[PDB]
Design a protein around this ligand. Sequence first.
Ligand SMILES: [Ca+2]
Ligand SMILES: [Ca+2]
Lengths: 207, 207
Amino acid sequence: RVTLNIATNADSLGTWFLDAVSKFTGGSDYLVNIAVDDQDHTVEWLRGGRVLAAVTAHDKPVQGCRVTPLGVLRYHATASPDFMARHFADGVTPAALARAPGLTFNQKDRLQASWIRTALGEDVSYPTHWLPSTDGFVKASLAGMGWGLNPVQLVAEHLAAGRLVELMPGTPLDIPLYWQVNRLAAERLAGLTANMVGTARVVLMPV
Amino acid sequence: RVTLNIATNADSLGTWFLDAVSKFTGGSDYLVNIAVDDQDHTVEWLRGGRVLAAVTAHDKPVQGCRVTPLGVLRYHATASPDFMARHFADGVTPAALARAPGLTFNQKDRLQASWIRTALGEDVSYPTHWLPSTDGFVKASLAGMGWGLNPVQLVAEHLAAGRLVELMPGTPLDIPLYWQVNRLAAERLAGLTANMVGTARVVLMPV
Ligand SMILES: [Ca+2]
Ligand SMILES: [Ca+2]
C-alpha cells in the first residue's frame, strides 16, 4: 500500500478530520500517516514535502500548493457551573480573569487571550493550567478545573444539558480552516480532497 | 500560584488522569503543566527535573524518585463489524493480518505487535495507518478505518453495543502503570499523590 502523509491541527483531529479521512480510506488502498501540528510547523512541512496535504488555519498559499477554504471552526469559552460560581461569582470581569484558572493548550495558543480581548475590550493576563489536548480541554472544563476555548462540536451537548456554560453567551471565536495540497499530488488525491471538503461543508460553518 | 510540571502517557490523559488531577486542583491553589509523553522521554524529564511527577509504564525507579504502582491499564484489540467482515472474513490469521490496515500510535508503539505475538504465537508484519492520538484511535476504530489496541475504559460501551468487536475475544493486553515523584517534592505533593493513587484504584485493574 502507499502511505499518505497528511497534517492536521489537534482540534480538527478531535472533531471532524477522521470522519473525512475514513470516507477516503474506506474506498481506496491508501494508508495514512497523520501528523498533528500544534506548533505551527505545517507550512514548513508542506514546503519540505514532509506532508502532502494539511488542514491548517494558514490561508496563505505555501508557494505551489492548491488551497481550498473549508469553513469556520467555532469555539466557545466554557467552564462548569461550579467553576463559574467559585471564580466568577460577581461576573466575568478583568479582576476575576486575573485570578481564575484558565486552560491553555501550549505557548502558541492565543485563543483564550483573543477571546478576552474581544469579550472585555482589553487584554488581561490570566493564570493557567497547560493542557496540550483537545479532548483533555473538554474533560478539564467539565471537571471544573479551568475555563477555556473549546470547539462547538465537542461542547454543544454539554451546553444544552447545563454541564458547561458559556462565560459570556454570544461571544464565539471563529477560526477559518483551509485544506492545502501539494500541487503534484493534487489530482491523484482528488478523492481525499472531495471527502475533506464535503465533510467540512456539513460540519463547519460556511465561509 | 505555583505551577506543577507533571507528565502522563496519552492513554492515561485520554482516560483517568484528569479525573485525578482535578480532584487535587479543586482543593488547592496549584496550577498544572501537563506534559504528554509518548516518545518515552519521561525518565529523562524526571532525571533533569523538567517534571516533578509522572504517570508512566516505567517501573524502575529513576534514581531518587518515590515510585507507587497504580494498577493495570487493560487494552483490547478492536475493530468495527464492517472492518472484521472486509478484512477477517475467514478469521484473524497471519495471512489476514499481513493485509488488514492496523492503527499504530507512533514508531515506539509496540502494542499491536505485542498483541499479535500473544494472540497468534508468531510475529506478523502488518500494514498500518499512523495515528498519534488516543481519542483518534477510538474514532478510527469505530469508523472502520483500522484495528488497534484501545484502553478498555474507552471501548467498553462500544463493545457492549456491538459498535466495536474484539478481534479475538479474551485476549487483552495489560500495561501496569506507576506514579513516580521527585523525592524532594513528594511530601509537599502528598495530596496530589493521594488523588492519583485513589483514582487509579477505582479505574485500573488491581496490581
Ligand atoms: Ca482550545
Ligand atoms: Ca493504542
